[PDB]
Each structure stands twice: as structure tokens, then as C-alpha cells.
Design a protein around this nucleic acid. Structure first.
Lengths: 114, 119, 139, 56
RNA sequence: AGUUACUAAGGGCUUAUGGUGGAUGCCUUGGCACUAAUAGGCGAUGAAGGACGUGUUAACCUGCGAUAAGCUUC
RNA sequence: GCGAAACAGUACCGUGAGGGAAAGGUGAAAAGAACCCAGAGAUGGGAGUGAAAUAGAUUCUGAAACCAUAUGCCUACAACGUGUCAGAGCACAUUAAUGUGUGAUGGCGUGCGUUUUGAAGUAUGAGCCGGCGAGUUAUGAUAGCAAGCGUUAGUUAACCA
RNA sequence: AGGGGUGAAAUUCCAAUCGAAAUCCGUGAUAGCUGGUUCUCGUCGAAAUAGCUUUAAGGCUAGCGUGAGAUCACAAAUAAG
RNA sequence: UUCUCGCAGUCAGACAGUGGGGGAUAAGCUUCAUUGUCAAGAGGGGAAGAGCCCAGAUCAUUAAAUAAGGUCCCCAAAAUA
RNA sequence: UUGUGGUAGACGAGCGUUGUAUUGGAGUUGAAGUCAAAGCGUGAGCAUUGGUGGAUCCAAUACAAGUGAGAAUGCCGGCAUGAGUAACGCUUGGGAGUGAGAAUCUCCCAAACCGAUUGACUAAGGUUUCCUGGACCAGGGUCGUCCUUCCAGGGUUAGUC
């Protein structure tokens, strides 16, 4: 009862190598190497998915504090102004996108006056 | 190094030069490697220069620069030279022979060239 | 416009013929003969006959103009090789490969058929998508 | 001394890039229809246009 | 003076064309295990087995044996 | 699968005892590429038989590793286990979908198994690719779950139809 | 002619190899030492401590983890006294 | 964290703190007990660091409060006296 | 409500392939295999389509595995790499002719080496490597028109050795 699994192994390696593409040179030509490349790429993609949300808030803090200190006030001042009175849910990204919205940031700065 | 080919030293080259000048005197045209023609041109021109005078001292001198062939002997080549070739080139100051670059050899693609002479 | 001619792997290494034919590829036929005659290579002799046979086939069998023909592309493929043994010092043996190369050439009479193959592939993918989408019509 | 790691196809091709050859020379012979390279004889029995040998 | 056209000797990515290798897929005058009946030796009248020879047919396999790739009786 | 489907203990090796090879598939009928051209021929191209020559004797197909080839894009101030998250622009248009290819440039990032307290490791193995490649069975016991029977029942070893 | 021969002796040679040649078998000898051991997923999930050992690389028992059952608050912990 | 049952696994630990001994309160050293970590579990701070600090990760978020820790720039992150 | 770090290790639930067996279907109006493209899946996998392809399969269920390949300094086979790199393993030229093709073929000429040798009778051995005609796929460390290479035809003769 000889049982051959050549076709099964070939199909498995084919579907494994189908994921790997666009590598450097011959790297997307070896099954064993491409396996490690795919696994490492997946792990690093998970890491980037975990940390991009971590760094985007800091990016928006930079991009908004630029405008704030251009008006003569730190990002800390804006956070305090939001904190004590008239607490808003407007996100740091959306408040950063208000820069992309013309004639809007002035409305916020005049509104937060107290 | 230890036992190997004996090489192609300058003595072998000059012996081949004597052989080839004898051959070209016998025929008047020789096809071979260009580099050897370049070296043998000077000696051939000197022999032609010494062939104009036909003096027994000069005969003895040129005796040291011929060989034995089947077309003619050393004496036969010498007398044929001194009879007809000597007054042929008595009017030009050198440049009695011309080397023309032929096509590369089949074997090692050596640049072939033909040495020829005419009036 | 191909007029291909094959020789089916005479003994020649690809490393030696690839560069020279790519140097000669992409030009007319007469100048190709002139430069190949002035080429001190075994590849020159091996390819002169192939070029002449290809020109003859294009003119006679294919009826091509010949005056507008040019060498379309080199394809110097992996021809089957030979394995031999050689004595080696200290009483050993070594294996050496005698390499050969599949010989085949293409000739184009037009500045195209590079994009015509693209048209053929486009028709092929269109028939593919047609076969895929008409399956959705079985509702 | 010996090679430690095997090279790559692209790297070996970049190395072999200098193995490529340049174009040859080509001159024109008028009386004998032929494009013979420069400072060479003509197969029609001549060198350049000066007849010096047999037509071979 | 400042931006990139244009550069690529060559290489890389994407796409397919052709080439080697017979991998995979399909099959089997082959091997393997058996099932049930027989049988369990040959040979000095010189065995099996080899070498040799034999053909309109060179050589191999095979058949046979100078009566020789075969005969006689039924 | 017998080493041996193939003229196999043949080829071959060691003096020699002895050890010990690989390989099957045209096609339906050769119905074997007639005729012509280049070429000394081989070979190739037309041409024909043949449904088919993606069936041409390398004759069921022709995968992977490998070799080129070019569509389009990018690369010659460039310190990256070579990629990720993005992304200008370019060329396209699919199992039509925030599409695909590709990336000037920004952020981030020192392989796989291995055994050790442990390796990006200057610890070891791995060039790659394709197949193949290593916890079965015979009996007996124990444990778990289910069942049959079930308070002298269950069950046959062997043997026979 | 190999628990043999041979050896102006050196553990020399015995088919380029020999503290005792090669060949086939017992034998698939043995390997506390190396190396490897090929589908997916879910849940729980320690130790490198102790004793013994012709014993320290190993092996046996404990403790520990895990799974099934029961105990199920008198048991066990966490705080207060 | 009780008992029984089945399957185990580990003894070649290391590091940091405390109390030590030996060594020299020399050694990233040895021997110990205790408190935590890695082993067997990643992350941020710590210039990058298995055992230090904060801390215990189903997955997706271009959402918020934060811990350690930090705010001239590289590099998000404040000033007054 | 606890939740979804985890090696060893425990436990549970499934998937893929072959064959057998029953119920089915497709198939020269194209099956499988193969390659490709821009799908579905928690994953074992399932597809869909294009074409090679030219006759086999797939779907549902139990039973049984030469059943599930990432390494074993794994077995074989193929392929690069190194790399046009060292070497070509004790050596010249000219003429004429042939040859499609001349450093390598033939003939002639020379030059050079040994000459108690690079001489010759002949043994062991090789066991036809011998000769002629034709040719040069397989080897000639390139070369080949030639070779001790291949085919065809011949060839060693004893009373005194």
C-alpha cells in the first residue's frame, strides 16, 4: 500500500510560495527562504500595526502644536483649555485635519477664549 | 622551474629569422605572424644593403646568414641574388620590402601579415 | 515576421556566444555579415551559416522582403551538456562539463510584433475574464 | 584562501558587465565589394585599393 | 548659480515567450503475496551448467547440436 | 516493486575471494516528415501524410531549480538580514473591487531549525531545487469511553461446515 | 595467511592503507552520548528543588503541572484579631 | 493549594535585592535561604541591553486616561519664581 | 463573569490525500495533471477562470494508512556559483597541393634534441592497438580535413626457429 504525497507537497509549497513576491532578486525563488521572509514580514507588519497608532497621535501633536505655538500657546495650554471648561471630543487627528479645513482653526481659537 | 618546455628564446627567434629571410629570398613572399616580420625587416634590409657591392669579403660576411633549401642551394640563392636582385633595388634608399596585415589565423587568431617585395 | 531557424545545441558555451550575438543583434543583414566575417570567433562561423539559412528561409518560404528585415532578438538557451572525468593528483578523479547551447534566431521585418504579442496576451486575458463573468449568467 | 559565501545572480552579472566587448572597426573597399576593417588587406587580391596578391 | 528632463554601463521589480530536467498526473507483457490440484529430483546409456558451432539472415537474444534456428511415428 | 519491465548479476571495480549500474510509454495506422530552399552534410525552414507534427523519432504531458528576453517603472551622494507601515509620480484596467504593477522619499526594523541558563552570533548544520525520508505490527496486560449480556452469566481455545 | 605468516627488529611488511588485511554472516552488535523525526485549531499549563544511586551527561521516587470524578465548606487561601 | 486515577515534565539554572559564608563584605566567582524576573512572556523607560524600573499583549482602530519615565534639537513631549 | 504570554507537557475538537464499499454526476461538446490571474476561508483547505492537456475523475459516508516534509555534516537526481580563473601534464618554421574550411591533412624543405640514446632483433605483457578504402555524432586537455577514433574490406602460413 504505497502512498505517494508528491502532488500534495508540490501544491502545498506552491500555495506557500504564492504569498511571496516582489522580493530582491532570487529571494522570491527558494521555498525555504521565502517561508522565512513571509513569516518575518508578517511579524513586522503586526508590529507596525501595533505601533502606528502609537506614533500617529504624537505626529498629530507635532502638527497641531506647530500651529498652536505659531499663535503663542503650547499644546499643553490647548489640552488644559479643553480639560477644564467646554470639554470636547474632537480628536487630535480631526483637530489636526481642521488645518486642512480653511477658515476653521480661527473658529476654534476664538471659541476657546475664556 | 623544473623540467618543462625549453622556451622560444632570442636565439630561436634569430634562427627563425635566418630561415625566413632565406625563404623570402627563395620566393619573394612570406605569410606569417606580423611581429616576426617586424623584427626581421631590419636584418633583411641590411642583407639587401650588403648585397649591392658583391665583394668577396661581403660574400664571406653574408655566407653566415643563409641556409640550405630544395628550390636552390646557398650558393645558388647567393648567385641569383647577386646577379639580378642586387641592381634591382640600387636606386631606392631603403623600404625594399612591405609588410601588409592579413586576417587573423584560424588557430590562435594570431594577426597574420605578408612580407613582399617588388620594384 | 519571425522566420526562425534552429540548430539544436551544437557544442558552444552560452557565456561566449551571448555577448557577441547581443553585440550583433538589432541590425540589418548585410552589415551583420560584414562584421561577422571580420570577427575572429568560432561563434562567428557558427552564426554565419545560421544567418544565411534564416535569410534564405525568410525570402523563399516566408516571402519576406528581406530589405526591411533585421535581427529581432538573441535567444541563446541552455542546451544539454556532457559530463566527463579527468585524472587528478594523489590518485583522484574530477568531473568536467562540456557545455553546449541551443541555437535559434528570430528576424523581424517590422518595428513591431513586440506589441502584437501584447495584443495576443490581451485577447487571451479578455477571453479569460469572459469565461469568468459569463459563469455569473447562470442564475 | 578560499571563497566563503556564494555570490548572487545580479552581483555576478554586475561583475561580468566588464566582460562585454566593444564595437570593431570597419572600412570601405571600393573596387572589391567588401567592408574590410581598417589597415587590413582585401580578399579580392589587394590591400586597401592597391593590388598585391591573388584574389583569395 | 538653483528643479528635473536625458541619462544605465548594468541591475532590480512586475508580466509573459522560449530553452534544459523529467518532476507531477495516467497506464503496464515487470516484480511481490497468495488461493486451489499436481509433484517433490537429475545423472556414468556421461547430468544441469558453461565454451564452441549451426541461419539466403552481419550482430545479439533464442532454438538446436556437425543429422545442427531442426527430423520421424502417432 | 526481485539488483534487474529495459538482452541484469549485464555494464563496471578491486588481481581476487567479493561488491555491484541507470533507463518504459510517437502515433490510430510510420500513416517516419514525400516535394522545394539555404547549407558539403548534419540542421533548419516552408510542403505533405496525418484530426492534430502543443504527436517529428530529445516523438503521452513537460513542474521545480537554472538560462536568457523584452512591455512598463525605478536605480550611478550611496551606510538597509534588503523588508514593513506609508507614499509622489508613472502605465494600466481585475475573480470591478477604497484595483493592479512600481516606487523619489519618511518612520520602523541585527535570519530558520539546533542544543544550552541562553545566540543576529566570531557555537553547529543548511547552496538551492524535485521526489523520497524516520512512532507500525503480532501477542498479552492495564487505564478511559461505548456496547452486549448481566447475577453462574459472558465467552469459547482448538476443530469442523 | 592473519588471538597468523614475515620481520639485521622499527610494533617492519603482508596489494599506495595493519597493536594486527580484506571479504560474507551472526548483526539491524551496542551507543546513559550526537544529530533528526513530515496536517489545523481550542483550553489549561510547571521545574531546574530534595532524597537515593558503581552515582553526578544518566536512571528511580517525591514536589510540581495537566486531564476525569468526588469532596464542594469543617478544606484551602486574602484581609482583621 | 484535598484524595484517587491517566499522562507527564525538570534537577547543568542564571540574574537583580536582602541576610550571609567562602573567597578579600576582590571577582559578571562559588555556596546558601528569602523576595521578584527570564527561562516557559512580549512591550515602554533604561544610548542601544533576559533577568533593573513601569508593567502581563484575543485580534482591528489614523480613539481616550495614563504608569515608569521624559519635555533645546536630533525625537512627539512647559513654563514661572 | 473570567477571559483568549507560553516551552516542556496535558487535554479537546477538526481538515487534506489514496484505496475498498455502497447511493450520484461529469467527461473528444475535454477528465486529471501542469503552469498563470487582480477569490473564499480562524487554518488544516476550498475554489473560479484562461489556455497546455488528451482520457480520467470529483462530490457525500465509514473502514485501513509505504498518510500529511524545514533542515537529520539527511538518499538520489538537476542546477548554478566560483569562472572564462589555473592549466592544456618532458618541443619549430617555410613552400606546394588538397580540403568548403589549413599552425594542426598530405608531400617537400629546412632548423633544433638524444645518440651506450630519442637506435635496432626480440621476450613478458597488451591481444589486434596491425594494413588498406571511406568517414570523423562519442574522446583527443583547443585543433581536426586527422588520431592507436568509427564502418567496410584484408592480414600473422614452419621436419629443421
Amino acid at each position: 500500500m504505497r502512498i505517494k504525497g508528491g502532488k500534495q507537497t508540490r501544491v502545498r509549497r506552491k500555495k506557500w510560495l504564492k504569498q511571496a513576491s516582489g522580493s530582491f532578486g532570487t529571494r522570491h525563488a527558494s521555498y525555504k527562504v521565502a517561508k522565512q521572509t513571509v513569516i518575518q514580514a508578517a511579524k513586522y507588519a503586526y508590529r507596525d500595526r501595533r505601533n502606528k497608532k502609537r506614533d500617529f497621535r504624537s505626529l498629530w501633536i507635532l502638527r497641531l502644536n506647530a500651529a498652536l505655538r505659531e499663535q503663542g500657546m503650547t499644546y499643553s495650554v490647548f489640552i488644559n483649555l479643553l480639560k477644564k471648561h467646554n470639554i470636547e471630543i474632537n480628536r487630535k487627528v480631526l483637530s489636526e485635519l481642521a488645518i486642512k479645513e480653511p477658515s476653521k482653526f480661527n473658529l476654534i481659537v476664538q471659541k476657546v477664549k475664556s | 622551474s623544473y623540467i618543462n618546455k625549453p622556451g622560444k628564446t632570442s636565439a630561436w627567434r634569430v634562427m627563425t629569422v635566418r630561415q625566413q629571410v632565406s625563404a623570402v629570398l627563395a620566393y619573394g613572399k612570406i605569410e606569417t605572424t606580423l611581429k616576426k616580420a617586424k623584427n626581421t625587416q631590419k636584418r633583411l634590409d641590411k642583407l639587401i644593403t650588403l648585397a649591392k657591392v658583391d665583394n668577396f669579403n661581403n660574400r664571406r660576411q653574408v655566407k653566415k646568414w643563409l641556409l640550405n633549401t630544395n628550390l636552390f642551394d646557398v650558393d645558388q640563392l647567393m648567385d641569383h641574388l647577386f646577379s639580378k636582385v642586387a641592381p634591382k633595388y640600387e636606386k631606392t634608399p631603403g623600404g625594399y620590402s612591405r609588410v601588409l596585415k592579413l586576417g587573423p589565423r584560424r588557430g590562435d587568431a594570431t594577426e597574420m601579415a605578408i612580407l613582399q617585395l617588388t620594384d | 515576421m519571425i522566420a526562425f531557424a534552429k540548430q539544436f545545441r551544437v557544442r558552444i558555451s552560452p557565456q561566449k556566444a551571448r555577448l557577441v550575438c547581443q553585440l550583433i543583434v538589432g541590425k540589418k543583414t548585410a552589415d551583420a555579415q560584414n562584421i561577422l566575417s571580420n570577427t575572429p570567433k568560432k561563434a562567428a562561423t557558427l552564426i554565419a551559416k545560421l544567418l544565411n539559412s534564416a535569410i534564405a528561409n525568410a525570402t523563399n518560404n516566408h516571402g519576406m522582403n528581406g530589405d526591411a528585415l533585421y535581427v529581432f532578438e538573441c535567444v541563446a538557451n541552455q542546451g544539454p551538456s556532457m559530463k566527463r572525468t579527468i585524472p587528478r593528483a594523489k590518485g583522484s578523479s574530477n568531473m568536467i562539463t562540456k557545455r553546449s547551447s541551443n541555437l535559434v534566431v528570430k528576424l523581424s521585418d517590422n518595428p513591431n510584433e513586440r506589441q502584437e504579442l501584447i495584443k495576443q496576451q490581451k485577447a487571451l486575458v479578455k477571453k479569460r475574464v469572459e469565461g469568468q463573468q459569463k459563469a455569473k449568467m447562470a442564475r | 584562501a578560499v571563497q566563503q559565501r556564494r555570490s548572487s545572480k545580479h552581483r555576478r552579472d554586475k561583475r561580468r558587465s566588464h566582460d562585454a566587448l566593444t564595437a570593431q572597426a570597419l572600412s570601405v573597399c571600393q573596387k572589391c565589394g567588401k567592408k574590410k576593417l581598417f589597415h587590413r588587406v582585401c580578399s579580392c587580391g589587394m590591400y586597401g585599393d592597391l593590388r598585391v596578391k591573388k584574389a583569395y
